[PDB]
Coordinates of C-alpha atoms and ligand atoms in Angstrom, one line a residue:
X17 CA -0.7 20.2 -13.2
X18 CA 0.7 18.6 -16.5
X19 CA 4.2 17.0 -16.9
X20 CA 6.3 16.3 -20.0
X21 CA 8.3 13.0 -19.9
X22 CA 11.3 14.7 -21.9
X23 CA 11.8 17.2 -19.0
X24 CA 12.1 14.5 -16.3
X25 CA 15.8 14.0 -15.6
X26 CA 16.7 10.7 -13.8
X27 CA 18.7 11.2 -10.6
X28 CA 18.4 8.1 -8.5
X29 CA 16.3 4.9 -8.1
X30 CA 14.5 4.9 -4.8
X31 CA 12.6 1.6 -4.7
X32 CA 11.9 -1.4 -6.9
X33 CA 9.0 -3.8 -6.4
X34 CA 7.5 -6.6 -8.5
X35 CA 4.9 -4.4 -10.2
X36 CA 6.4 -0.9 -10.0
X37 CA 9.4 1.3 -9.2
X38 CA 9.9 4.8 -7.7
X39 CA 12.7 7.1 -9.0
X40 CA 14.1 10.4 -7.7
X41 CA 13.9 12.8 -10.8
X42 CA 14.2 16.5 -11.5
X43 CA 11.4 18.1 -13.5
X44 CA 13.6 20.5 -15.5
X45 CA 11.7 22.1 -18.5
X46 CA 14.1 25.1 -18.4
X47 CA 17.0 22.6 -19.0
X48 CA 19.3 24.4 -16.5
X49 CA 19.1 22.0 -13.4
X50 CA 16.9 24.7 -11.6
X51 CA 13.9 22.4 -11.6
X52 CA 12.0 20.7 -8.7
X53 CA 13.1 17.3 -7.4
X54 CA 10.0 14.9 -7.6
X55 CA 9.2 11.2 -6.9
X56 CA 8.2 9.3 -10.0
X57 CA 6.3 5.9 -9.9
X58 CA 6.3 3.8 -13.1
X59 CA 5.1 0.3 -14.1
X60 CA 7.7 -2.6 -14.4
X61 CA 5.5 -4.1 -17.2
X62 CA 3.1 -2.0 -19.4
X63 CA -0.1 -4.0 -20.1
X64 CA -3.8 -3.0 -20.2
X65 CA -4.4 -5.1 -16.9
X66 CA -1.4 -3.4 -15.1
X67 CA -2.4 0.1 -16.5
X68 CA -6.0 -0.3 -15.1
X69 CA -4.7 -1.2 -11.6
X70 CA -2.2 1.7 -11.7
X71 CA -5.0 4.1 -12.8
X72 CA -7.0 2.9 -9.8
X73 CA -4.0 3.6 -7.5
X74 CA -3.5 7.1 -9.1
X75 CA -7.2 7.9 -8.6
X76 CA -6.9 6.8 -4.9
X77 CA -3.9 9.1 -4.2
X78 CA -5.5 12.0 -6.1
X79 CA -8.6 11.7 -3.9
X80 CA -6.5 11.9 -0.7
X81 CA -5.6 15.4 0.8
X82 CA -4.1 15.2 4.3
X83 CA -0.9 16.4 6.0
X84 CA 0.2 12.8 6.7
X85 CA -0.4 11.5 3.1
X86 CA 2.2 12.0 0.4
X87 CA 1.2 14.8 -2.0
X88 CA 0.0 13.9 -5.6
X89 CA 1.6 16.3 -8.2
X90 CA 0.3 14.9 -11.4
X91 CA 0.7 12.3 -14.2
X92 CA 3.0 11.8 -17.2
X93 CA 1.3 10.3 -20.3
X94 CA 2.6 9.2 -23.8
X95 CA -0.5 7.5 -25.5
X96 CA 1.3 4.6 -23.1
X97 CA 4.0 4.6 -20.5
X98 CA 2.0 6.3 -17.7
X99 CA 4.0 7.7 -14.8
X100 CA 2.7 9.0 -11.4
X101 CA 4.4 12.3 -10.2
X102 CA 4.5 12.9 -6.4
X103 CA 6.4 15.2 -4.0
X104 CA 9.9 14.0 -3.0
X105 CA 10.3 13.3 0.8
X106 CA 14.1 13.6 1.3
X107 CA 14.5 11.6 4.6
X108 CA 13.1 8.3 3.1
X109 CA 11.3 5.5 5.1
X110 CA 10.7 5.8 8.8
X111 CA 12.6 2.4 9.1
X112 CA 15.7 4.0 7.7
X113 CA 15.3 7.4 9.3
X114 CA 15.0 5.8 12.8
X115 CA 18.2 3.7 12.4
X116 CA 20.3 6.7 11.0
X117 CA 19.1 9.4 13.4
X118 CA 18.1 7.4 16.6
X119 CA 20.6 9.7 18.6
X120 CA 18.2 12.7 18.1
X121 CA 14.8 10.9 18.6
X122 CA 13.1 10.7 22.1
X123 CA 9.7 9.2 23.2
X124 CA 7.9 12.6 22.6
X125 CA 9.1 12.4 18.9
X126 CA 8.1 8.7 18.4
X127 CA 4.6 9.5 19.8
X128 CA 4.4 12.5 17.4
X129 CA 5.0 10.2 14.4
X130 CA 2.6 7.5 15.9
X131 CA -0.2 10.1 16.1
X132 CA 0.6 11.3 12.6
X133 CA 0.4 7.6 11.2
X134 CA -2.9 7.1 13.2
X135 CA -4.4 10.3 11.8
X136 CA -3.4 9.6 8.2
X137 CA -4.9 6.1 8.6
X138 CA -8.2 7.4 10.1
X139 CA -8.6 9.7 7.1
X140 CA -8.0 6.6 4.8
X141 CA -10.9 4.8 6.6
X142 CA -13.1 8.0 6.0
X143 CA -12.9 7.3 2.2
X144 CA -13.4 3.5 3.0
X145 CA -9.8 2.7 1.7
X146 CA -7.8 -0.4 3.0
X147 CA -4.0 0.1 2.8
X148 CA -3.2 -3.7 3.1
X149 CA 0.6 -3.1 3.5
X150 CA 1.1 -0.4 6.3
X151 CA 4.8 -0.7 7.1
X152 CA 7.8 1.5 8.4
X153 CA 9.0 0.9 4.8
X154 CA 6.2 2.9 3.2
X155 CA 5.7 5.5 6.0
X156 CA 8.1 8.3 4.7
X157 CA 9.8 11.2 6.5
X158 CA 9.4 14.8 5.1
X159 CA 11.4 16.3 8.0
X160 CA 12.1 15.7 11.8
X161 CA 8.5 16.8 12.7
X162 CA 6.4 15.2 9.9
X163 CA 5.8 11.6 8.5
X164 CA 3.5 10.6 5.7
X165 CA 1.9 7.4 4.3
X166 CA 3.8 7.3 1.0
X167 CA 2.6 4.4 -1.1
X168 CA -0.8 3.1 -2.1
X169 CA 0.1 0.3 -4.5
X170 CA -2.0 -2.3 -2.7
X171 CA -4.8 0.1 -1.5
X172 CA -8.3 -1.3 -2.1
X173 CA -11.7 0.3 -2.0
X174 CA -14.1 -1.5 0.3
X175 CA -17.5 -2.7 -1.3
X176 CA -20.4 -0.6 0.1
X177 CA -22.2 -3.7 1.5
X178 CA -19.0 -5.5 2.9
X179 CA -16.6 -4.5 5.8
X180 CA -13.8 -6.6 4.3
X181 CA -12.0 -7.2 0.9
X182 CA -11.2 -10.8 -0.2
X183 CA -8.1 -11.1 -2.4
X184 CA -8.9 -14.2 -4.6
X185 CA -5.2 -14.8 -5.6
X186 CA -2.1 -15.5 -3.4
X187 CA 0.2 -13.1 -5.3
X188 CA 3.8 -12.0 -4.9
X189 CA 2.8 -9.3 -2.3
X190 CA 5.5 -7.5 -0.1
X191 CA 3.1 -8.1 2.9
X192 CA 4.8 -10.0 5.7
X193 CA 2.9 -9.2 9.0
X194 CA -0.4 -10.7 7.9
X195 CA -3.4 -10.4 10.3
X196 CA -4.7 -14.0 11.1
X197 CA -7.9 -13.6 8.9
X198 CA -5.8 -12.2 6.0
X199 CA -3.5 -15.2 6.0
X200 CA -6.2 -17.9 6.7
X201 CA -9.2 -16.3 4.8
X202 CA -7.5 -13.6 2.5
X203 CA -9.7 -10.9 4.1
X204 CA -8.3 -7.3 4.4
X205 CA -10.1 -4.6 6.4
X206 CA -9.6 -1.5 8.7
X207 CA -9.0 -4.1 11.5
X208 CA -6.2 -5.9 9.5
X209 CA -4.7 -2.4 8.9
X210 CA -4.9 -1.9 12.7
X211 CA -3.0 -5.3 13.1
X212 CA -0.3 -3.9 10.6
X213 CA 0.0 -0.7 12.7
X214 CA 0.6 -2.6 15.9
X215 CA 3.8 -4.1 14.3
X216 CA 4.7 -0.5 13.1
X217 CA 4.3 0.7 16.7
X218 CA 6.5 -2.2 18.0
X219 CA 9.3 -1.3 15.4
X220 CA 9.3 2.4 16.3
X221 CA 9.9 1.7 20.0
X222 CA 12.6 -1.0 19.0
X223 CA 14.8 1.4 16.8
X224 CA 14.8 4.0 19.7
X225 CA 16.6 1.5 22.1
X226 CA 19.3 3.7 23.7
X227 CA 22.7 2.4 22.4
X228 CA 24.6 -0.9 21.3
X229 CA 21.6 -3.0 22.7
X230 CA 19.4 -5.8 21.1
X231 CA 18.5 -4.0 17.7
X232 CA 22.0 -2.5 17.2
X233 CA 23.9 -5.7 18.4
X234 CA 22.0 -7.9 15.9
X235 CA 22.6 -5.6 12.8
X236 CA 26.3 -5.6 13.7
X237 CA 26.5 -9.5 14.1
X238 CA 24.9 -10.4 10.7
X239 CA 27.2 -10.8 7.6
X240 CA 24.7 -9.8 4.9
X241 CA 23.0 -6.6 3.4
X242 CA 19.8 -4.8 4.6
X243 CA 15.9 -4.5 4.3
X244 CA 15.2 -8.3 4.9
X245 CA 17.5 -8.5 7.9
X246 CA 15.1 -6.4 10.1
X247 CA 12.3 -9.0 9.8
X248 CA 14.9 -11.7 10.8
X249 CA 15.5 -9.7 14.1
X250 CA 11.8 -9.5 14.8
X251 CA 11.3 -13.2 14.0
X252 CA 14.1 -14.0 16.6
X253 CA 12.5 -11.8 19.3
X254 CA 9.1 -13.5 18.5
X255 CA 10.8 -16.9 18.8
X256 CA 12.4 -15.8 22.1
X257 CA 9.0 -14.6 23.5
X258 CA 6.8 -17.7 22.8
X259 CA 5.3 -16.5 19.5
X260 CA 4.0 -13.1 20.7
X261 CA 5.9 -9.8 20.2
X262 CA 7.7 -8.6 23.3
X263 CA 7.7 -5.1 25.0
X264 CA 10.7 -3.2 23.6
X265 CA 13.2 -2.2 26.4
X266 CA 12.2 1.2 27.7
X267 CA 8.8 1.1 26.1
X268 CA 6.0 2.5 28.4
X269 CA 3.3 0.0 29.5
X270 CA 0.6 2.2 27.9
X271 CA 2.1 2.0 24.4
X272 CA 2.7 -1.8 24.8
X273 CA -1.0 -2.1 25.9
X274 CA -1.9 -0.4 22.5
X275 CA 0.4 -2.9 20.6
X276 CA -1.3 -5.9 22.5
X277 CA -4.8 -4.7 21.6
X278 CA -3.9 -4.2 17.9
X279 CA -2.9 -7.9 17.9
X280 CA -6.2 -9.2 19.1
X281 CA -7.0 -12.4 17.2
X282 CA -10.7 -11.3 16.8
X283 CA -11.4 -8.8 13.9
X284 CA -14.1 -6.9 15.9
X285 CA -11.9 -6.7 19.0
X286 CA -9.2 -4.4 17.7
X287 CA -9.1 -0.6 18.4
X288 CA -10.0 2.1 15.9
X289 CA -7.5 4.6 14.4
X290 CA -9.5 7.6 15.6
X291 CA -9.4 6.3 19.2
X292 CA -5.7 5.3 18.8
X293 CA -4.8 8.8 17.8
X294 CA -6.7 10.3 20.8
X295 CA -5.0 7.8 23.2
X296 CA -1.5 8.5 21.8
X297 CA -2.2 12.3 22.1
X298 CA -3.2 11.9 25.8
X299 CA 0.1 10.0 26.5
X300 CA 2.1 12.8 24.7
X301 CA 0.3 15.6 26.7
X302 CA 1.0 13.9 30.0
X303 CA 4.8 13.6 29.1
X304 CA 4.9 17.4 28.4
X305 CA 2.6 18.4 31.3
Ligands
LIG205 C1 6.7 9.0 -3.0 C2 8.0 9.1 -2.4 C3 8.6 10.3 -2.0 N1 9.8 10.3 -1.4 C4 10.5 9.2 -1.3 N2 11.7 9.3 -0.6 C5 12.7 8.3 -0.4 C6 12.3 6.9 -0.3 C7 13.3 5.9 -0.1 C8 14.7 6.3 0.1 N3 15.7 5.3 0.3 C9 15.8 4.3 -0.7 C10 16.6 3.1 -0.2 N4 17.8 3.5 0.5 C11 19.1 3.3 -0.3 C12 17.9 4.7 1.3 C13 17.0 5.9 0.7 C14 15.0 7.7 0.0 C15 14.0 8.7 -0.2 N5 10.0 8.0 -1.6 C16 8.8 7.9 -2.2 N6 8.3 6.6 -2.6 C17 8.9 5.4 -2.4 C18 10.3 5.2 -2.6 C19 10.9 3.9 -2.4 C20 10.1 2.9 -1.9 C21 8.7 3.1 -1.7 S1 7.7 1.7 -1.1 O1 6.6 2.3 -0.6 O2 8.5 0.8 -0.4 N7 7.2 0.8 -2.5 C22 7.9 0.3 -3.7 C23 7.8 1.3 -4.8 C24 9.3 -0.1 -3.5 C25 7.1 -0.9 -4.2 C26 8.1 4.3 -1.9
LIG206 C1 4.4 -14.2 5.4 C2 4.0 -15.3 6.3 C3 3.5 -16.5 5.8 N1 3.1 -17.4 6.6 C4 3.1 -17.3 8.0 N2 2.7 -18.3 8.8 C5 2.7 -18.4 10.2 C6 3.7 -17.8 11.0 C7 3.6 -18.0 12.4 C8 2.6 -18.7 13.0 N3 2.6 -18.8 14.4 C9 1.9 -17.6 15.1 C10 2.4 -17.6 16.6 N4 2.1 -18.9 17.2 C11 2.4 -18.9 18.6 C12 2.6 -20.1 16.5 C13 2.2 -20.1 15.0 C14 1.6 -19.2 12.2 C15 1.7 -19.1 10.8 N5 3.6 -16.1 8.5 C16 4.0 -15.1 7.7 N6 4.5 -14.0 8.3 C17 4.4 -13.8 9.7 C18 5.5 -14.3 10.4 C19 5.5 -14.1 11.8 C20 4.4 -13.5 12.4 C21 3.3 -13.0 11.6 S1 1.9 -12.3 12.4 O1 1.9 -10.9 11.9 O2 2.0 -12.5 13.8 N7 0.6 -12.9 11.8 C22 0.1 -14.4 11.8 C23 1.1 -15.4 12.3 C24 -1.2 -14.4 12.6 C25 -0.2 -14.7 10.3 C26 3.4 -13.2 10.2
LIG207 CL1 20.1 -14.1 21.5
LIG208 ZN1 3.0 -8.3 -16.0

C-alpha cells in the first residue's frame, strides 16, 4: 500500500543507530487520531550512497513473508526522504520483554520463542540472506506467544558462488558478539549467524533466572543507565568462566549443549537452523508429554 508523509503523526522514538532510526507513528489520513500505529524507519543522513543501501534493505524485507519476520507495510517517498513503514510490535525487544515480564515466563515459553527465532532464521537462509547482527535487541515481541526478527539493516545477500560475505571495511557496526572468522577475516555467513544465535540462546536462559540471583543482583549493583550494561554482565560471567560462556543456572543440559555447538570455532562444525528448530521442538514436546 501507499503512504503519505503528511498523515504520519510522530508519537515516540523507538531506536536510534548510526545510520537510521525507528519511530512509533500513527498513520492518520482522517486526521481524527483513529489511524493505525506503525513503525517507521528513516535515514539519519540522506545521500545517494545511504539511499541505495536503504533501498536494498527495503527490498530484502519486502521479499520476506514469515510469521517470525516483522511485516512490511510500505514506503513513504518525497522525490527524497525515503521512509520504511512496518507493523508496530508493542512489547519491544526480547531483551527488554524478558527483564520486565520474567515473572510470567517459564522454560516452555523460552523454548517456544527459541523455535520461532530458529524458524525465522532458517527461512532467511532459504533466500540466501545473512542477518549479521542477530541479537535479543532486534528480536521483537508481538505478544506473549509470538516473537519476530524485526530489523534487517545489516542483512546481506550471499554471492551465488560463495558461502560467505566479506565486509571490506571495519565500520561503526552495532555487532558485539562476533564469530571468530568475522572478527579475524571479516567473513559473515549462515554459520556466523548460528554463532550469534548461541549467544541469543544463552541470554534467554539468563533473564529467566528465578529471582534476585546473578542477572538481577548485577543490574541492581550498577550505578548507570541501560542497554550497554547487559554486555558488561556477560563479559564478567565470561571472565569468571575462563573465556567461555557458562551454563545459566537452571538451564537444561540439552539447551547448553546446543549453545556449546553454536560456539564451535570451526565454520563447518556449527549446527543448521533447520536442525536447531527440530531439536528445540523435541525438547518442548518432552516437557509437555
Ligand atoms: C519494526 C519495529 C516494530 N516494533 C517495534 N517495537 C518497539 C521497539 C523498541 C521498544 N523499546 C524502545 C526502547 N525502550 C525505551 C523500551 C521500548 C518498544 C517497541 N520496533 C521496531 N523496530 C525497532 C525499534 C527500535 C530498535 C530497533 S533495532 O533493531 O535495535 N535497530 C535500530 C533502529 C536501533 C538501529 C528496531
Ligand atoms: C567487539 C569485539 C572486538 N574485539 C574482540 N576481541 C576479543 C575478545 C575476546 C577474546 N578472547 C576469546 C576468549 N579467549 C579465552 C581469550 C581471548 C579475543 C578477542 N571482541 C569483541 N567482542 C566480543 C567480546 C567477548 C566475546 C566475544 S565472542 O563472541 O566470543 N567472539 C570472539 C572472541 C571469538 C571474537 C566477542
Ligand atoms: Cl562476582
Ligand atoms: Zn552519511
